[PDB]
């Protein structure tokens, strides 16, 4: 919860991080379950890891509810940090001024992990007090004080001028640069904080350095080619960074930023990091958008992609035949296939538990029980907010106990959907058809 | 000097710790499920324990869906943040609607936070003058100014940099400013009295001399979420340059929030709220008419409820046995697909009785400040317990427009029946359009 | 003022300057030698017409 | 006490020809705090509704028709037209 | 240090007077698709015909792709390749005309190569060659300039014309570090050296270590520019603080629509160029698969475009049969293409190769990933590979050897590629799985 | 001069050989047969240059592959020179910046162009002496340039800033230079030496220049300020009217005094077989204006549904456009015809093919289309530059053909086995059993 982070449906679960044995566990970081479908993850993921093999591909299926958004994230949250994660859903590639195929080409090169290293030189503590001896800087040395060496430096044409640049008073910390550069304050000294008593935003107060002067620093960035991309768009593309006015980025500028990373990466300055890709219900898609995958996903840096749908015998989006899946052939070919099982008992109460254990939320056993009953009857989402509305019925009830009397008052006023459904049907009189057709009229 | 419109008359759910109601309370009467149910959703709401939680409620138009709202919206105080907006207003043009459903949500949630800081302020004296030490010409880095107020005098001075916000300000030895050490430039009260009437017009203020010590402190609380900050970052604030004075003349339009932004925004605050400044409260979200949003929405929400941060929203739609808006055979109860149902429960707002109707509109009478008879009150019931209340409802001005015509302060039969005639409703133009040679 | 300064040391961005010019460098300085025809930009070709 | 609200009302033409994202702007507006009275109109009688794929009497849903007031016109004889036209007439001084 | 699903496909198979073997060159079988392609890049590399185009017609995992690679590689730097799909054409920000335009300009190529004389050395003195004033009045008229210079190994004095005084005057010399200027163009050009680096104790001064060579040399420059490179440098206007160039700037500049004039004068420059010798033009090979969704319009377009002059070849590909062309369903034509399209373009087929063949893409990919499988399971390997697909087993072989890794082992036994086919399903049993399951799974 | 290019297919033809009298040689300047085609091509020629016409619609029709484009760009080539033409395509009509509307506003403006006429003057010799008085870091300075001929010596002067013009580059004491007074441009006709000779005649001679502009440049011109931009970036869309009224008025007094001369050219538009009816209403407004360029037409298909309409009018054309339009069909080819096309375009490419290898182009143009022969021509030449002679046999040939593929023979091989690629319900198969 480092950010304003409050809690999630699936917060229990961090990491599909498998046991060094790979066999899956009854029970494991709160999943219960998935035995050869986290065994197969985790193979994925350690192939992910592996940073060496493109182009590979996962489907994954079954009825939702059964943590497959849950399996993405957990699967992120063991690959650990470095690697960002390309959080978008199906309905975010129709977009206005990006079209599907470089929108998807974006989160690929987004997806895409990069290091990059670089060094430069400094001069630290430079308490100065320049006094020389009108203009012209004749003799033209300057007094340099840091914590080790306290000397007087010689200059030249561009330092006798350039000490007259950054007019100051020359008694404070200064940085200049050993290899030609120039010079930049870092902030004053603790005795300029009381010479005035209320600083200007500019000034700050800030301690000598406790040691010597030559600093040779190296620096480590990672950043994704495609921030690069935004930043050399144009003659000053910084200001695009955040803003999102791309542009729908021509191929080009892709082709020489991959000859500059594989140019970097065999002189050493760069190395890659895996990524991956995850959208959910891929069922609601173009067909293009199928056809371009089916191409695109065997480059030489393409990263897996993290199918999952859970629709059935369906048409295709863009197109009118019946197909596998909602899905083409094509699509459905050149991948491996994740599927999920219906809920038992033991794990749905075993889930509701732990559920209410990150709600910090006391179940009884016979709400407990009546809980995975409706859970089981119906799915586990609608035990999963009835157990917050009746620990918000307990809490009102002057308890933190739930048992049947909240679970009971919640069923009564929460209706299950066949129920609900029902009463659609038996109650159509005050209901609305598709032409407006409504009987408003009562008596 | 008043405006009522089919509100004014709520005030509150009107329940209690125990969950009792009300029967004629807070301008609501009756719905004792809804409003129990209403009442546990706002207890659960007010503990900021919990984020994402969604209800759906069945009721049909006039039930009292946007009454329970407004309700529910004033049960959290004002300060509460509250974006209930129409289901229409998703389709933009600007900018994708899911991402403003993302922009939305941004909304929602709420902060608190707070800020203090120091002023000082007209001027008693002034005495200008470091050394260059080298090459340069000089080194000008401080200024006595003076500093008049009210109740005492402290000059002093500071960096430069606030002397050549004295120029900025353009102000006289005369001249009253207002400088938050903060930043060290001036805020300009204006000129001064003391040193005023040099002449016997001014077109600039004289203003009031400050008021109080001039060494003023102060400390500030205000509550602002988050996309008010993404969006004054997102444009520049200063400048002096043609590009600044070019990109405030030019109009912004509508974008795409970054999700980078997003991790930005959310780490500053924590680092803001980690050292005591602001103070966190969920939000609530409302949308009406949501059966004509189509299954994209439908089904994209059914991930975006999984957000952490996503505030309790509230579902509502009125009709049945409905095909969502653009789907060939998803056709569903109230219009949303049953793989979104499946992530939260169904309430059922009902319509109203005849003792309940009845004093309906004897309280819309008062609101009003109209007085009704017990005849045309009964009348105007009864033919709303047939049909409809909203036309008794509409029909309740314009009866008083008449009343007041005739120079009475009271509904008759009269009234009520000539404005049946001069007003039809929509059960009288069921069976008389069909006649009608011209269309 | 310890307060103000401990506000105002940290305004860090999120992408340094120098991220930028390392971003913004020549390696191949330069190519095709004659070129000032090849393209004689429109700020010069106005003037010739 | 330094301004003056002035609640005017609004005039609107061929409603029938409206459609449903407006129907819904409109429903939740009159149900708002702040709308000003609406003078709204179709000369189509029983036309198809715009925007959507059924057609009502107004060209109107039964939802925002039971919501709103109706008043109905019913065409002119003779005379009146023929006094219109003198009107007309005069007015032109012909 | 990176695959996917290639790295194994080099080349055709090719050989002088165009023969194909039977396993060579990494592609297997397909003598007649490669003998064909191999004729293709010869005809290339004759330019000899203008927008000439071929399709293709198989199944999944023929060699579309991967014959369109190996063109490709055989091309090189001299010869841009640009590979593209029609669903890339789908452009919200300009219009379907202007993109294949741009395409058109991309796919041609011009070399520029020139040479220019370089003086270098370090000016080791500068001083005037006097003579008597001898026109109106008197004094001073230097004749010419002389000035040593001293490479590594070259020491060199230019004799030059007055003149170039005031590059001394404008370049500001000083003594002795950078020297740049020819025996005609003339003027030097200063970019001090590393031998009094150490004079200062920090500056922001220029160093260099001493000139290698002798003093006269020569540099040759190859480069390969597209003519849209310069038509978007004549186009986009950059500059400073005129009104037209910053104006750009700020506005942020879209694909504006280049008006035919400077495309004409660009061509005309760029012939009279080449003509001259100094230049050469050289064609690039557009590429466009999966052309089935096409629309009626950009078919049309194609026909119209397909005479052009300048007009280089594309090479276009699809797999699709009996079925309704894409844009409108007017037209029920096979491979998704009208019969305007098909009876005037060259039509090459394809076809999945034998169980032998196919065996041998397994193991060639089987050893590119570095895992290997011994006999008593790649013969069943082959075999469900023939029953199943080859996407199928190639894709499903990584799985089974990262078990076994896992599985502390290096080969693949029956043990672990029987429970992996026991997990693991594909398009059939998806299909089983969607009309079986009762689950909305 | 010569434009770049490749051996086109319409590199082979140019003209269409006609006589005083139109008549049509069997096979002239390229063209072969059309014989009625080039007459009415002939007629519309004399037609156009007549100059007395405007707004005039013109249509053909035929079957796939029959020269109609073929005998449209010999009629845009026979037009001369000096003469501005433009021409469009089928799917260029649409555009973002322009509305359809205005798009075709534009063809039809651009193909109508004016010629103005004026004096021009000119300094010419060489360069042979030169004295510039010039202080060093000064403001005020004198020249004496020699700019001579072999017949005389002339040391001509410089004004107030003519000494940075003719001192822009180097200027030596031997070169031919030539500049104009009005401006004082600067134009190498080359170096002396170090290589043309020392010029004789006069040094100042007056000659006339004629400078051509189309109405759509005059218009986008001179009514706004960026519009220069325009001229190549075209940041312009549909410019006001009334500056077109005001230079519609100016071209007509123009012509009415006799400054200028006009030059009407034609516009071109072919494939209009698909377009939108609200098109071609525009079409049949602008055929009657006052300046209306020559339009011809092109279709390939017959009884058809024109694009935003729904009744197959016959020749994918609404019969208001129909009636007003002049219909030139175009038959099939002769054998004879299609052997002598054969023929004429291996000698464009210039390949030495046998006697063998037009047999079987004319066998396989008898048999199927000819531009599948205009690619066998060149798959069959490589086979047998794969042997190195410089002669193609009938191995080569059917080796080619029984390699590559035509339309009908892939269509069976598909309608055999429609199971194995993709098919309109979607299913693929990629394993041989
Ligand atoms: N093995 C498990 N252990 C604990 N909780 C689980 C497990 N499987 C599912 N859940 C719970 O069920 C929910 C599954 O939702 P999910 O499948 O991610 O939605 P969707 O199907 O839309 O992706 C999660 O909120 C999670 O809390
Ligand atoms: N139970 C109730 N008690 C008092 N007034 C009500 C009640 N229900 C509805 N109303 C009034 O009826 C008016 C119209 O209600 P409306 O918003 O159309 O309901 P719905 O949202 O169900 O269509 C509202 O202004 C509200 O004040
Ligand atoms: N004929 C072939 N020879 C060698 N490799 C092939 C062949 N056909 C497919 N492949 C392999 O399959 C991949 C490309 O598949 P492709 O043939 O494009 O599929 P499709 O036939 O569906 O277009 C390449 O990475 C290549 O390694
Ligand atoms: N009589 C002919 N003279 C010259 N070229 C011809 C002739 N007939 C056909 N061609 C060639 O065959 C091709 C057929 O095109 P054309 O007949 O112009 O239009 P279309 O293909 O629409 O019928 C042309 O490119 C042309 O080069
Ligand atoms: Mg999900
Ligand atoms: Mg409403
Ligand atoms: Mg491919
Ligand atoms: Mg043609």
């Known amino acids: 919860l480092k950010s304003l982070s409050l809690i999630a449906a699936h ?26 479908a986290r065994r197969a993850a985790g193979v994925i993921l350690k192939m992910v890891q592996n940073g060496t093999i493109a182009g590979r591909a996962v489907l994954v299926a079954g009825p939702p509810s059964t943590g497959k958004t849950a399996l993405a994230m957990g699967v992120s949250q063991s690959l650990g940090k470095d690697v960002p994660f390309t959080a978008i859903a199906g309905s975010e590639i129709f977009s206005l001024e990006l079209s599907k195929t470089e929108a998807l080409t974006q989160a690929f090169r987004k997806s895409i992990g990069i290091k990059i290293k670089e060094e430069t030189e400094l001069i630290e503590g430079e308490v100065v007090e320049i006094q020389i001896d009108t203009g012209g800087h004749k003799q033209g040395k300057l007094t340099i ?22 007019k100051v008073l020359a008694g404070d910390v200064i940085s200049i640069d050993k290899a030609s550069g120039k010079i930049t304050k870092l902030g004053r000294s603790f005795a300029r904080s009381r010479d005035y008593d209320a600083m200007g935003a500019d000034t700050r107060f800030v301690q000598c350095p406790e040691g010597e002067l030559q600093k040779r620093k190296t620096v480590v960035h990672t950043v994704s080619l495609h921030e690069i991309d935004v930043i050399n768009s144009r003659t000053q593309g910084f200001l695009a960074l955040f803003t999102g006015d791309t542009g729908e980025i021509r191929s080009e500028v892709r082709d020489q930023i991959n000859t500059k990373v594989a140019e970097w990466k065999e002189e050493g300055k760069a190395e890659i990091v895996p990524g991956v890709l995850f959208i959910d219900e891929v069922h609601m898609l173009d067909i293009e958008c199928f056809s371009f995958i089916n191409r695109a996903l065997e480059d030489e840096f393409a990263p897996i992609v993290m199918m999952a749908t859970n629709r059935g015998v369906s048409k295709t989006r863009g197109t009118n035949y019946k197909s596998p899946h909602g899905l083409p052939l094509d699509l459905l070919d050149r991948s491996i296939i994740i599927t999920t099982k219906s809920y038992n008992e033991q794990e749905i109460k075993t889930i509701l538990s732990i559920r209410a254990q990150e709600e910090e939320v006391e179940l009884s056993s016979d709400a407990l029980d009546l809980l995975t009953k409706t859970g089981v009857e119906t799915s586990l989402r609608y035990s999963s907010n009835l157990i917050s509305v009746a620990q918000q019925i307990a809490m009102k009830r002057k308890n933190n106990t739930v048992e049947v009397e909240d679970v009971k008052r919640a069923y009564l006023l929460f209706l299950d959907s ?26 | 000097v008043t405006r009522t419109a089919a509100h004014t008359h709520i005030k509150g759910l009107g329940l209690d710790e125990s969950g009792v109601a009300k029967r004629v309370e807070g301008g609501f009467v009756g719905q004792i499920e809804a409003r129990e149910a209403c009442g546990v959703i706002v207890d659960l709401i007010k503990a900021k324990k919990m984020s994402g939680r969604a209800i759906l409620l069945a009721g049909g138009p006039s039930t009292g869906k946007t009454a329970l709202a407004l309700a529910i919206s004033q049960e959290l105080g004002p300060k509460v943040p ?15 609607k899911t991402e403003t459903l993302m922009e939305n949500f941004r909304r929602a949630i709420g902060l608190r936070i707070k800020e203090t800081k120091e002023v000082y302020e007209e001027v008693t004296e002034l005495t200008p003058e470091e050394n260059p030490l080298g090459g340069y010409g000089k080194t000008i880095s401080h200024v006595i100014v003076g500093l008049k107020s009210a109740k005492g005098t402290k000059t002093l001075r500071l960096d430069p940099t606030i002397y050549e916000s004295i120029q900025r300000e353009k102000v006289s030895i005369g001249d009253v400013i207002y400088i938050e050490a903060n930043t060290g430039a001036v805020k300009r009260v204006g000129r001064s009295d003391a040193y005023a009437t040099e002449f016997d017009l001014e ?17 500030i609380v205000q509550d602002v979420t988050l996309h008010d900050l993404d969006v004054a970052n997102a444009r520049p604030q200063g400048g002096q340059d043609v590009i600044s004075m070019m990109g405030q003349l030019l109009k912004p339009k509508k974008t795409e929030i970054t999700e980078k932004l997003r991790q930005e925004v959310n780490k500053v605050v924590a680092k803001y709220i980690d050292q005591g400044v602001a103070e966190l409260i969920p939000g609530v979200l409302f949308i009406d008419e949501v059966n004509m949003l189509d299954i994209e929405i439908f089904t994209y929400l059914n991930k975006a409820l999984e957000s952490n941060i996503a505030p309790v929203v509230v579902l509502a739609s009125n009709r049945g046995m409905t095909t969502v808006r653009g789907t060939e055979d998803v056709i569903s109860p109230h219009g949303v697909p049953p793989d979104l149902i499946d992530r939260l429960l169904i309430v059922r707002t009902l319509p109203y009785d005849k003792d309940e109707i009845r004093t309906i509109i004897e309280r819309r009478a008062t609101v009003e400040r109209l007085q009704v008879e017990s005849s045309a009150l009964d009348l105007l019931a009864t033919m709303g317990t047939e049909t409809s209340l909203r036309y008794a409802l509409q029909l309740l001005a314009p009866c008083g427009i008449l009343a007041q015509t005739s120079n009475r302060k009271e509904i008759v039969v009269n009234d009520v029946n000539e404005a049946k005639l001069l007003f039809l409703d929509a059960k009288r133009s069921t069976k008389i359009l069909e006649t009608s040679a011209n269309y | 003022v310890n307060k103000l300064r401990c506000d105002r040391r940290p305004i860090f961005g999120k992408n340094l300057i120098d991220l930028l010019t390392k971003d913004r460098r020549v390696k191949y300085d330069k190519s095709s030698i004659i070129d000032n025809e090849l393209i004689k930009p429109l700020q010069t070709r106005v003037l010739d017409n």
Not at chain 2, 203 to 219: A, F, M, R, S
């Open chain 1, 11 to 36: 917060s229990h679960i961090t990491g599909l991080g498998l046991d060094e044995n790979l066999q899956p566990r009854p029970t494991s970081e709160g999943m219960v379950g998935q035995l050869q």
């Open chain 2, 203 to 219: 077109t600039e203020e004289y203003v009031p001399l400050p008021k109080g010590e001039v060494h003023k402190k102060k400390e």
């Open chain 1, 145 to 166: 004080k840091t914590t080790d060496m306290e000397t007087i430096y010689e200059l030249g044409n561009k330092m006798i001028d350039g000490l007259t640049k950054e």
């Open chain 1, 418 to 443: 066949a129920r609900s459904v029902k009463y659609v049907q038996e109650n159509e009189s005050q209901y609305i058809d598709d032409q407006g057709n409504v009987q408003i009229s009562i008596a």
């Open chain 2, 82 to 96: 509250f974006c209930p907006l129409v289901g229409s207003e998703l389709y933009s043009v600007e900018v994708k």
